[PDB]
Amino acid sequence: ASLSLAPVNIFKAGADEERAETARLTSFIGAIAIGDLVKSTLGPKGMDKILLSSGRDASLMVTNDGATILKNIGVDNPAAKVLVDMSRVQDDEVGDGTTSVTVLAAELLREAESLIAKKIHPQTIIAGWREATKAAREALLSSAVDHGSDEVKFRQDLMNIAGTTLSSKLLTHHKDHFTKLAVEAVLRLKGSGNLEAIHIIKKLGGSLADSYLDEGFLLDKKIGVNQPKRIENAKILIANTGMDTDKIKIFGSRVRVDSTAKVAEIEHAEKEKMKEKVERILKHGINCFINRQLIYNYPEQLFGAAGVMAIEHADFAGVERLALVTGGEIASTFDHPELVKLGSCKLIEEVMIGEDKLIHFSGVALGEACTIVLRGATQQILDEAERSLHDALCVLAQTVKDSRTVYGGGCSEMLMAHAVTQLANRTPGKEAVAMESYAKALRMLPTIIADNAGYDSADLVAQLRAAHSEGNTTAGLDMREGTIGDMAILGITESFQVKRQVLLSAAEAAEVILRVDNIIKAAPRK
Amino acid sequence: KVQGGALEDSQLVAGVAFKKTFSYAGFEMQPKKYHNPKIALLNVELELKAEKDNAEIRVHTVEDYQAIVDAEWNILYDKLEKIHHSGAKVVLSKLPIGDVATQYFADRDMFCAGRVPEEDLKRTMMACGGSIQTSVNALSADVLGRCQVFEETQIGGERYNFFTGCPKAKTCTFILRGGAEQFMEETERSLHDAIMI
Amino acid sequence: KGAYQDRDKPAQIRFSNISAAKAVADAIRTSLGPKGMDKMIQDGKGDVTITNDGATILKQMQVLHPAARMLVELSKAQDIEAGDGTTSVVIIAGSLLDSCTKLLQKGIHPTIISESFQKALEKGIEILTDMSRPVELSDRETLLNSATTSLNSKVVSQYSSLLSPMSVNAVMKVIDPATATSVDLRDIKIVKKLGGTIDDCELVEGLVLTQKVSNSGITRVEKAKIGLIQFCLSAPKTDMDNQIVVSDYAQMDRVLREERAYILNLVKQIKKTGCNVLLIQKSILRDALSDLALHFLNKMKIMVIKDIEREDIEFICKTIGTKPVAHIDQFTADMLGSAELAEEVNLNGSGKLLKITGCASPGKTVTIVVRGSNKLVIEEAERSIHDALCVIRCLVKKRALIAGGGAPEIELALRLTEYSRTLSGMESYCVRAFADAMEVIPSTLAENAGLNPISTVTELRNRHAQGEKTAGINVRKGGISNILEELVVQPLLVSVSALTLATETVRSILKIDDVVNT
Amino acid sequence: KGAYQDRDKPAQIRFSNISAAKAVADAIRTSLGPKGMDKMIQDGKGDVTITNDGATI
Amino acid sequence: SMGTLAFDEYGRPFLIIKDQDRKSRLMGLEALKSHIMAAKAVANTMRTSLGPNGLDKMMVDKDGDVTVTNDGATILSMMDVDHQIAKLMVELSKSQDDEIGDGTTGVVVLAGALLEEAEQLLDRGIHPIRIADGYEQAARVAIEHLDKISDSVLVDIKDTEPLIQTAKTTLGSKVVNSCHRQMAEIAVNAVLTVADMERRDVDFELIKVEGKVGGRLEDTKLIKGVIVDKDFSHPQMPKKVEDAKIAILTCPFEPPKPKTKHKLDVTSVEDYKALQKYEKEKFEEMIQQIKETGANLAICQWGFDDEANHLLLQNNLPAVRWVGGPEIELIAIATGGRIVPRFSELTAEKLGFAGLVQEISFGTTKDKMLVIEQCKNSRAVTIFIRGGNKMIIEEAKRSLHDALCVIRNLIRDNRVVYGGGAAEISCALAVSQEADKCPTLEQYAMRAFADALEVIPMALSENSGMNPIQTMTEVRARQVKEMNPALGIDCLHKGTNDMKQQHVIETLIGKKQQISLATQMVRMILKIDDIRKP
Amino acid sequence: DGRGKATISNDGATILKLLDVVHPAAKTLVDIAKSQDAEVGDGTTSVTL
Ligand SMILES: Nc1ncnc2c1ncn2[C@@H]1O[C@H](COP(=O)(O)OP(=O)(O)O)[C@@H](O)[C@H]1O
Ligand SMILES: Nc1ncnc2c1ncn2[C@@H]1O[C@H](COP(=O)(O)OP(=O)(O)O)[C@@H](O)[C@H]1O
Ligand SMILES: Nc1ncnc2c1ncn2[C@@H]1O[C@H](COP(=O)(O)OP(=O)(O)O)[C@@H](O)[C@H]1O
Ligand SMILES: Nc1ncnc2c1ncn2[C@@H]1O[C@H](COP(=O)(O)OP(=O)(O)O)[C@@H](O)[C@H]1O
Ligand SMILES: [Mg+2]
Ligand SMILES: [Mg+2]
Ligand SMILES: [Mg+2]
Ligand SMILES: [Mg+2]
């Protein structure tokens, strides 16, 4: 019989059990809904969405990022939740591909519904899909190219990768600008992948082309009162001390006396302890003192009398980035100055951006952390610019890690689809009919890219398929005119990491959604 | 009642057996089989604690402060050292045994179990042949317990401590297996009928 | 036959956004110009607000459509970058979108519209810069005229004769005119006090405080030495838990006496420096000014103002040269500020103010006291004065001046029509749309003035084609004239930033094709 | 491997029909034979009927 | 369906049970048939999740979280059941998982089949207790036949191919069969690293199964050591330490503090300065004690403060803080170190050694993990699972749990029966033969038991697209003709029906536990003839 | 029970404890089954019968 459609219902009021065809129906419709939603953002001519939350704050986001879109929607379909989590994991692994993995998974599930209707078992389909995934992996890995050795060509590949990552986003207006920004900012990390080192400050106002990458560093913290505002040849002590009614950690300690005179002596002793702390600090020979924690009035006064710029309430991120940009050591003990390394920058001034003042470190020593000032007309423009910059920076970091590159514009998907097609037409059985569907989804990726522009997607994908069958393994969509071209020449290149991750995560999620023949829901908590 | 297993897999242990009790770190560093252990049965909290709840320390010197800290540590360590010198390789307390004591016994290659239930403690007493001690100051062989084998084994998803080999045992522990809570409960009721009969 | 475009929701979304934006623009079109009027806005809580400021109006009307929200953010960005033009920018954005409507209908792609709009923007920045004339900050008449133009639109425009010279003095007092590239309007403090009329607004070179004086009888001090006290004048209290255990009756008398002596030693170390005015920071967690301390200070003839806020400290120091003292040991004479007078002035039974006027170290700080008969008119006077200060700030940033009265908009419209005729293609239609869209600000100026918008704008276009590029709508004569003779000038930065931000916001809204309910 | 049979509702319907039929059969199994007994049936209107006839029941 | 329906032979109220009007009751054969219907529903739900070609189920909890799984115990635990017989079946699967860790779906399918056959026997009029007793008889026969046809495998650390085959059979039905042999190998190596061969015990607390989204399933690996979700305490410490001498500490690097209520009284400037110097010297003494022991790394359980952190950095002592008790225990066990409660008690002998301590990144995330490995003879181990989504990660975790439990069951008893339904077919043949030799009325019950044992091969055939009856009859005939209890269902279509050749392998304890548990629960269900409930 | 927790028993004392008997005369059978389980441990169904 069945758990639900039995003379006895075996379930608590509010539960449910969708069976084989009903389950596959709701799963495919949910996944294909998610995919149809997230496409139309795919590619250079992709368009953005308005998120328009419904809470009482009604946040408003304008995004083209598929991961962001899926995270910020109320999904209740389980297969859709699977695809959402897949896109989130794509955004965690690499910073790009969150719309391509979702569209690919949805297209695979569309083809899988077609095959199930063709009366093929969703294990013969998974078998053929795994063989096709292997073929596509090997074709991709063979198509990949590496330029990490040659510094000039690696720079060119980085610029091309940044341009390709930004093409889909609102920064394609000033793409040649933000590309240089992102590349310089990721090269200033000197091989590290720490994306927290790249700080992004969104300043409302100004044009999007007024955005820049500070040659030094910028900090949105304040300087003390009687303390300088400009410092040339700055010697810097980065700290994490208390400097705020800093009490001895003995917590049972209490001042128990019989005289207000003694209370006053002890208060003076506390103040003298703070003074000796400040003096130990000054014995490092500094002109600037940054503290992760607060700096109270008395140490502020002492640093002012000493002529030291004392920046307070920087945070863990602030002091980490400052250590990276200057060369200093975040300290909490000052009894061995010979061991504490100081930071250096030619100048520390206070500059204006919009209507706010910021500490500007110029002429810094290392520069292994960065600040990018993002200017724009709307908070939505600024948030979307930050998201797009994050995309590009993540991709360039992943490329510096793995210099392997892979051509874009549908060239890679078309090459993988060609390999899958060869495997299929050399393979017997209905696994071949499932491999052909794998290849159809891979081809539907550039089909969608071309659709979003307004071109004859069918004609162009047919031309591409013919080219990759002839042996033009670098043919891809030229989206300026709406034709096919050489991605190697046009500079449309992607990170092999991002393309492989798209492929594998999409295939894996489609497999896991295809293995389901029953959806047993439990009564909502309500 | 250990869920999992068959009725014929059920068993009687001529000794005592009870489930593992909220071990701290170092319990896996402890050994799990002893071949002639002496057993210390205690009603003693073995961990760093306020020596008393209405107790208040008052010092005006950092030397006295450090003396007090070391004094708490020495109180605990002296309790543990007495337990170690009694020859007992297994230690059971009706009260908690902290992580410090756990690691102490692990380093001495002893076994410790705290928060043991009172009924299981009394059964261990009647089986091994000792007495339950609220004080560790007179840990004689007369008050220590003894079995021919102590072990911790896996029985159907749970870990159980077995004291087996007690020839002087006036106690037994049924360990019932089965495929459901109510299966095992009705098994227990049946055995209660048979036992009363 | 190309691609069928099986989906109509992208176009529907585009039209919905355009409609919302045009609705906002058409709602605030009446608050534009010298003949524009104010809007009253009653919040859900009942907070009333009368205003002519576009940013204020849009922020205060809880707009709900996404495109309208984006226009609100646009006006805020204009308020940041220029502080003037927050209505012109929204009107320009709404008009560009309303033109995108018919462009889309003609069947042009939003991307083509966006790129052609970027082209028109670059050409228009070129055109406005060509129209512009440089300015010297020494040109006080040019600064006065810029401020008067900025104020002509507001309720405080009959008081322009009073509030323009103040708005120029304040900024010229808080910046080095030779090196300054911008201005921090936090150097200009504004103090709204009910009472009197807007003709009573004042520019105080010294310091003004709303905090009350604690001494009775000492309200005025001449040759005032002032000290900032970040420590507490009360019984000693360690930062650790402290108690005073009494076990004998004598220790009680001793405790009271030693507390007295502690406080007296503090106030004596204060008096010994020559300090006669004492500003005490605000202190939670400890009494900053005990009654004993107040007694002793009063007996020593020292004015005391406590409850000073930890955010006004840097301002007070910048103003009266004081240095904040956090330990009595460092309280000396070099840490004081010398002021020729410190007085608690009364405002016709409408409150009290502490005025520290005259300073031996008056460092790049000024205060403006805004008076008024109503809370609403005071708030709008404050906003208008801020707009004037921001106009002077634009002039400091970019030493360039542009005529007003819709002259830049008409010149822009004309020259971009010419540019469109030269850039034949589908960009030609979009650039011509950009031009006719910017031709809407003169239309608004005319409608609000009470003229025939069509005739006025046609005469303006004709005279600008003849060559009178500094020709605009003279609301005093009632028609067209050289607007520099009416002295309607505004910084080039205002128009340029308005155009840039409007074009970017329009391109952003054009790149949108869907709305989701997260 | 033949045809996957992507649909389970036909089989579910077959089993539901079989269950209903077996339920009817098992309900009247007691009214069969010389040792079989009668059923009382009170209609919604309250018309009572005692019977051993399968068609009537 | 009502507690009491009289109300009295005299018209006076008849109230015997509380809320008897709101209460229900089912008695007799209808109660038995209701039980059988519920059990059949559960079993028919589960039988499609059986075997390599078995499909998964997508469970949604109260808060809307999704769980895709093929594990019968997890399915029936996530299932919001109200029927008490279905609850009994959930308990049955849970019991199979507790005792064995495999078979959680076979037990349910088999119990459902036994009850479905008891249905026809009750229709023919047999007493449910007679049915249960015939089932016990047939179950004993089948258990002895399993002991008879069983095979044995070597559980040594030299040749691990039999164990890898067993683990591969266990993982054939799970989504992680894309990395079939990699997963089997790491389950085998895990249990053999952490297994008491003399005791024949395997503590799973010594196996840390960690999952992290990202990467590929192929990236899942076995770390002979520990992984922690923490990083070094100071951001400027080094991220790699080779040949690390490790000090494991449960003392916070903070000034000492009595557990008893204490008040240290400061009564003078000299007392205050003495307190200050005491604090300074405590921090210096802690760091100096750790240094004199020779450690290159410290791992505390209770976190520390700014002075201690900076002194560690200055003294070149990378350090981890806020490490949990269980991972501290695992680190001690793995590195060979002893857990120290205070710095004074720290010595060069209480230290652990790890040939590599590293901080590992995970792409564009900001999340860091600490790997401790290259220990000498780690008696602890970690399985770090990677994948493209939390659903496949959780499924991989439970699948690897199944594989580990199977290797555990081999270490406990190495005897092995061959799967693919072959053992069930052979037991069905043995039960049929003994029923033929049985002259009592239980012959029918034993024939029913055989027909129920034959449901697992039928289910495998159905899930594999083959015709159940055709396939099963051919393989049964072959088993009886050519004596080979290793002949079963070719679920993967390798051509051969020989499960000993396909290396499809189950644990004898597993099959015996399936049979015993199914029979015992079917007995307790047939013994119920009255249900009461509100 | 009302909590939904099931008890499965052949023991008459258990069964009657679980039945929420409220009849004052029928409580006596429950009581004597309890008394039998107390004094002997078997015969709980026989006593009630
Ligand atoms: N200039 C370009 N010309 C052709 N194809 C491009 C270009 N830029 C990006 N693409 C393609 O668009 C796809 C990426 O689209 P995008 O919207 O960034 O989605 P994702 O979030 O998946 O990266 C890739 O197939 C990439 O090759
Ligand atoms: N006296 C005047 N005659 C003609 N036009 C004026 C005069 N004063 C201001 N304007 C014009 O009014 C417009 C700005 O008015 P306002 O209502 O403040 O809008 P915004 O907030 O955009 O500045 C500008 O085009 C300016 O040139
Ligand atoms: N005296 C009898 N002994 C045995 N069987 C009988 C006797 N009388 C009738 N039957 C059997 O009972 C059955 C019919 O009984 P009845 O309840 O009338 O059912 P139906 O409505 O099908 O005729 C037949 O199989 C008939 O042979
Ligand atoms: N490669 C295989 N070939 C044939 N049968 C298999 C194979 N792998 C597993 N099976 C069978 O599938 C049945 C179910 O195993 P599985 O679904 O993994 O766990 P469970 O026993 O808990 O359902 C087992 O009885 C086994 O005989
Ligand atoms: Mg992208
Ligand atoms: Mg204005
Ligand atoms: Mg299994
Ligand atoms: Mg009995």
Author numbering:
A (entry chain B): 2 to 527
B (entry chain H): 199 to 395
C (entry chain D): 21 to 538
D (entry chain d): 21 to 77
E (entry chain E): 3 to 536
F (entry chain H): 51 to 99
Quote from the publication.
The chaperonin TCP-1 ring complex (TRiC) acts as obligate folder for >10% of cytosolic proteins, including he cytoskeletal proteins actin and tubulin. Eight paralogous subunits (CCT1–CCT8) assemble into a hexadecamer of two back-to-back rings, enclosing a folding chamber. This architecture facilitates nascent protein recognition at the apical domain with a built-in lid, as well as binding and hydrolysis of ATP in the equatorial and intermediate domains to drive lid closure for open-and-close conformational transition. We trapped endogenous human TRiC with substrates (actin, tubulin) and cochaperone (PhLP2A) at different folding stages, for structure determination by cryo-EM.
For the cryo-EM sample, purified endogenous TRiC was mixed with ADP–AlFx, a transition-state mimic with a similar chemical structure to that of ADP-inorganic phosphate, emulating a trigonal-bipyramidal intermediate of the gamma-phosphate moiety during hydrolysis. Image classification revealed that 89% of particles (that is, 2.5 million) were in the closed state (closed-TRiC), resulting in a 2.5-Å resolution consensus map after imposing C2 symmetry. With this map, an atomic model of the entire TRiC–Nb18 complex was built. In our TRiC–Nb18 complex, the Nb18 nanobody is bound at only two locations of TRiC (one per copy of CCT5). The binding interface consists of complementarity-determining region (CDR) 1, 2, and 3 loops of Nb18 and a hydrophobic patch at the CCT5 equatorial domain, proximal (~15 Å) to the ATP-binding site. The CCT5 epitope residues (for example Ile151, Met485, and Pro487) are not conserved among other CCT subunits, suggesting that Nb18 binding is CCT5-specific. Importantly, our closed-TRiC model provides unprecedented clarity to intersubunit contacts within rings (cis) and across rings (trans), through three salient features. The intra-ring sheet formation is fully visualized in our model, and the consequence is a rigid septum mid-level between rings, acting as a barrier that constricts the interior into two largely separate cavities (one per ring). Second, inter-ring trans interactions are largely maintained at the ring–ring interface by fitting the ‘plug’ (α4–α5 linker) of one subunit, into the ‘socket’ (α14–α15 linker) of the subunit in trans that it stacks with. Third, our model unravels an ordered-coil preceding the N-terminal β-strand of each subunit, reaching out to the equivalent coil of not its trans stacked subunit, but to the +2 subunit in the anticlockwise direction.
